[PDB]
Amino acid sequence: TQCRLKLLKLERIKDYLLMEEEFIRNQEQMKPLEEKQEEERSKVDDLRGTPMSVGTLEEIIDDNHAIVSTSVGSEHYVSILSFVDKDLLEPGCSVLLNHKVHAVIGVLMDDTDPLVTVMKVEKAPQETYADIGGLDNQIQEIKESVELPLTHPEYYEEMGIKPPKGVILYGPPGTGKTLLAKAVANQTSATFLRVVGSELIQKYLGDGPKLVRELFRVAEEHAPSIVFIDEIDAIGTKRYDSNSGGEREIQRTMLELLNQLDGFDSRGDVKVIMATNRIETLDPALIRPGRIDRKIEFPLPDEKTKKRIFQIHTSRMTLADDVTLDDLIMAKDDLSGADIKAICTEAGLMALRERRMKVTNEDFKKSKENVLYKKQEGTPEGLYL
């Protein structure tokens, strides 16, 4: 264990010291690096000069040429300049070209797009793990699928199965489906990428599947990852009729996500947690077992689970004896986690209307009515029961 650390260190000491030692010492003694080493530094620096046009490396061709498309409105099949390497130009990265005659001087920039910025979402949530009470079983299921192979893939790939991936979150909406992905994500310490399913279908024509590729590619590079795809239910439910891409757009997008997931691609370390309303309203192409090994159906939240969530919100809220938790929970029926959150947020807002910075039993009682109607409403149901 400790002994290993010494071996790894052994490669790295030699790498810094050798580069330092060789550059200065070898120009000084005989003719090894000497005239040649200056020559590479100088030639590239002069050719590059002022200005340099930026281009993007589309492809590399095996005959000391490359297909660069330049940001000047002209594409080029460049010739390599003496003392620059063809095979250090990544297809992920954009390259810099001398703008007088088109040859790759070098890569000072890899460049950046607003397209990257959508996939990468940083989370630092107000509610996280141990801010959720009750429905304890549901969290344990998620973890066996997502956390355990992601941390230690070695047995899971080794046994012979592909690693069990992901979970499908369906049942009564409002249980706290969104809190759960964000909370489990912190514990595992996986890079959390959030992207809406409806955002993938958009006006632009052919941009739609390209974006889905990027979403997967970026998740993979980041390394441990979970992709929480919020409101994926959206592609299926709606045939939008407001996109110029049309019905064509919806078709081509839907296939690409499947391809990127496993497919023939068979990318690993990328768990997808799918938030849906129901998976009976979800598109039948997307849904299919064996990409997602486990499906979890939340029960209707009971009176019991509800108390634990509220004690946390009471701790976050102004403290008084005028906070009456029990009364609000009791009155309500067997209904979502969301409501406990809604009663607390509407209660603070309500206070501002009064010209009071206090949240008392009066704000809560008023809040109980609005939250209950909006969410499902008990007076229809009371007849049928």
Partner: protein, 116 residues
């Protein structure tokens, strides 16, 4: 006056804006009607005395910087101007007095003081 013709005659000029400013002593500028170019810093303006999205002048065929234009430009600032904010006061609109109170609380109050 004699000197002015010499200064006046030049290869030309361009107007770009700093997209990004490196730590490599080059500045990323986009000239407005053409593509992006990466160019070495001038004497007058370099990385420490520039902030990005500051419009900067260039003298052509070298693209070396001249003077910094103190104004900032982003696509968002033009957008705001073109859409055009209304003139009409809540008073003018009134008889919706009951409405101005209701809207006020949800939209306006959290943007003004998210602290509360």
């Amino acid at each position: 006056l004699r000197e002015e013709l010499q200064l006046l005659q030049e290869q030309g000029s361009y107007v770009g804006e700093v997209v990004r400013a490196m730590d490599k002593k080059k500045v990323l500028v986009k000239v407005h009607p053409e593509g992006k170019f990466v160019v070495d810093v001038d004497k007058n303006i370099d990385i420490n005395d520039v902030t990005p999205n500051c419009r900067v002048a260039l003298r052509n065929d070298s693209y070396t910087l001249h003077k910094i234009l103190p104004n900032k430009v982003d696509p968002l600032v033009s957008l705001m101007m073109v859409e055009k904010v209304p003139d009409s006061t809540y008073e003018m609109i009134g008889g919706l007095d009951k409405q101005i109170k209701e809207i006020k609380e949800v939209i306006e109050l959290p943007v003004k003081h998210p602290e509360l």
